[PDB]
């Protein structure tokens, strides 16, 4: 029993292999707490301030549920820019130093990348980054990795297909970053070439020992993977090249025909929300894990709230 | 002591005479709980997810108060369409299967009729329909009927005037539907002809044994009724016929002159919010029951939350 | 131990010197409660309804934190005008008489001055005015005065500089009003002439025994004051006179050069949010009290909630 080594949860680079493993063990303990028919009091007396600068229902409710499942309570806003209705203006550092007097922990979702680290540096209470604009989304990365460990039973020696908009894929990028901290990992980059993964991730994996391989053929890669992590490709990413959007039409979808070629022990993941890139009849298959994945986000966020406030 | 026979609260057709009577008895028990100076713990450890797709303050707070008066806690949103601020799109069934991992019961207010039943079919936790777009609003119907039983002392053998926009009146339609399950009921349809009640309700009552009668003369009908259930008529319902809107001007209002012709034991009901169809000086009369009616909504919604989560 | 002499908290004129002093003593007790590692239950079983007609994050969270630090619970809205999503319209008195059935105390922030007093007159539960449109903001006045007493150690015999837009300054006006209830007070009105304080305050102070003096020279006045209460001047207040806005540019700012001329025992206050009228490097100085000031708002609002619901 000791203090959590992290003062804040901001970026994926904060985590090493052993810290991840320990957090995942705590998440399993949080699942036991959530399953119990007794109300937990671990965080009784603690207040979480949800500081969202835009509405983002799923992830906010996941945090607020985690706090209340542990016996803590919540202050919420999805209008953080509106500091006062009578005097215009808002400054992140002033909001933090004001709200930290009302709460014991801040969960912030800003619109600008880099805001989370500034808030952590300013606040004298722990801060969790719930989505740093277009930047880091660390608890989504943790729950993604945790879901793989939970569903497949291991993180060493697995094969993961990262599908969709990889060039601009916030979560596929951070998922590959955390998976590179484990051994004998193989990652498939499944995409159209114009939204293929960028070199910084490609070069970080190689220099990490991770084997990787690019493809345009999801149906082939699928049969060899433990995990198929799906994300959308927005039509706007193709610009004027509707010939390429017509040539990709139906080639990166997860549907029953794709499930038919996958191992019985592989899973489909999707951070949500989804468009048509996973058909509705996939949901009935036990390998459709994207809703168990969301539930794992509750356990992970319970773990971080607990560790940051009362330690190991 | 046993399980509630309803898995969800969606539509008025789910309820028969005896179920209504039993629910109303539970609502009376909930009133005793709310009146107590001790905090209830009946729903300690349970979380209610308020899934509103549009802001609707009164009815949301009625639900959230009911949960907290019973010792449960709440997750709220009036922006349910905004599943994620970073990835556009929302799908009802995906929202339900995501949020049900954070909560024990869902109270949803969608914008499209039929959404509540789909959510119930998808969710593995109970669902309450708090307003199904232009469709069912069952807890408003229950609290309307409960208010009559509470104020008049009976439901068999009463006379109720349904006033206002009856053709498109969501709540007058469902109120008449539930009242038709009791005996020797008489219903007055008080309206301009162009917003008169529709045949489906007229034919369901007749085939239910309920006696009914249409009128354009509220001042006559009022003196014969136990209940005057008032609703607005929006000027837009008249279209271009401002001659009819001028001919109806002042004819379907509840004012002191109308109270002067009503029995001392009759009541005024209004689901709220009201416009000018009930004058402010009616409020001081003990027969103005529309605020006691709103309070009864708390008791009814306490009862449903309790029954759905812990049974009879 | 007895009943709070105030049924509601609406206007500064409700408070006399002795009531203020007693409230400030309770606020000090509330600070002890907030500091404790035990969850308070003083307001267990009580519900606060936050009825905000516009979003105003800081002050809402200050109230909602105060309630939860005392063990009470909260119903919130920043969309109070949206009584129902299906039927348009909202009437203050109908909202109050509806929501008071769901709660034990109402904290309202309306958009129109005079709304708070109407709500108090209508409600059978206590009401706190959290910002009456352009009108009274009493808890901000209380926390402003309380901050001075807490930081300087006294209210009799002090010198306070009120800086910024004084003509339209909601909080400088009410701060001077409450300070005039103490002895040997001296107030400096530091402003451009076109946003100078108005006669009603100037004449109320004189008739109160308070000495006052107007100035355009913050750097002089600062060295003689116990308190420098800063507020912005919006460029729009100058209208077309950009020559005056250019002549005032840099003359009413709080910066390190101004701190260099102030007593070591003086403080900087600012109700927040601020623009550029306090430079960021002032924050590191122990005399920058605007964030301790916000924290004092929590204690004051805890005190009022406690007194109004359970008395002295
Ligand atoms: O089709 C999709 C759906 C989601 N996401 C990522 O998953 C995150 C889900 O977390 P949140 O936005 O709900 O908090 C999004 O922010 C986004 O970065 C994608 O990349 N593609
Ligand atoms: O003048 C009125 C006021 C309310 N309603 C009905 O009463 C409901 C009140 O419930 P809620 O909208 O507040 O949840 C409305 O949705 C609407 O269907 C009317 O028909 N006419
Ligand atoms: O530069 C400023 C900042 C704030 N205020 C006053 O301080 C109040 C802060 O309280 P609130 O608006 O956050 O509730 C504002 O409403 C406003 O009246 C000013 O006069 N000038």
Author numbering:
A (entry chain A), B (entry chain A), C (entry chain A): 79 to 390
What do the study authors state?
However, much remains unknown in plants about the unique organization, regulation, and localization of the enzymes required for de novo biosynthesis of pyrimidines, which are potential targets for crop improvement and weed control. This metabolic pathway starts in the chloroplast, where aspartate transcarbamoylase (ATC) catalyzes the condensation of carbamoyl aspartate from aspartate (Asp) and carbamoyl phosphate (CP)1,3. In general, ATCs consist of a catalytic homotrimer with three active sites in between the subunits that can be allosterically regulated by association with other proteins. Each subunit folds into two subdomains of similar size: an N-domain (aa 82–221 and 374–390) occupying the center of the trimer and holding the binding site for CP, and a C-domain (aa 222–373) bearing the Asp binding site.
One construct spanning aa 82–390 (named atATC) was purified as a stable homotrimer, and matched in size (excluding the 2.6 kDa fusion tag) the 36 kDa mature enzyme in whole leaf extracts. atATC produced diffraction quality crystals readily and the structure was determined at 1.7 Å resolution. The relative orientation of the domains is similar to the open conformation observed in other ATCs crystallized without ligands. Unexpectedly, additional electron density in each active site indicated the presence of a molecule of UMP captured during protein expression and kept throughout the purification and crystallization process. The nucleotide fills the active site, with the ribose in C3′ endo pucker and the base in anti conformation. The phosphate binds near the N-end of helix H2 and interacts with R136, T137, R187, and H215 (at the N-domain), whereas the ribose 2′- and 3′-OH bind to the side chain of R248 (C-domain). The 4-O atom of the pyrimidine ring interacts with R310 (Asp-loop), and the 2-O and 3-NH bind through three waters to R310, R248, and V250 (C-domain), whereas the C5 and C6 atoms make Van der Waals contacts with the 349PLP351 loop (C-domain). In addition, the CP-loop from the adjacent subunit interacts with the inhibitor through Van der Waals contacts of residues A164 and A165 and makes a H-bond between S162 and the phosphate. With UMP, the CP-loop folds in an extended “inhibited” conformation, with A164, A165 and S162 interacting with the nucleotide, S163 and K166 pointing outwards the active site, and the side chain of F161 inserted in between subunits. Rather than occupying an allosteric pocket, UMP binds and blocks the active site, directly competing with CP, the substrate binding in first place. UMP binds to the subunit in a wide-open conformation, where the N- and C-domains cannot move further apart to accommodate a di- or tri-phosphorylated nucleotide, thus explaining why UDP or UTP are not inhibitors.
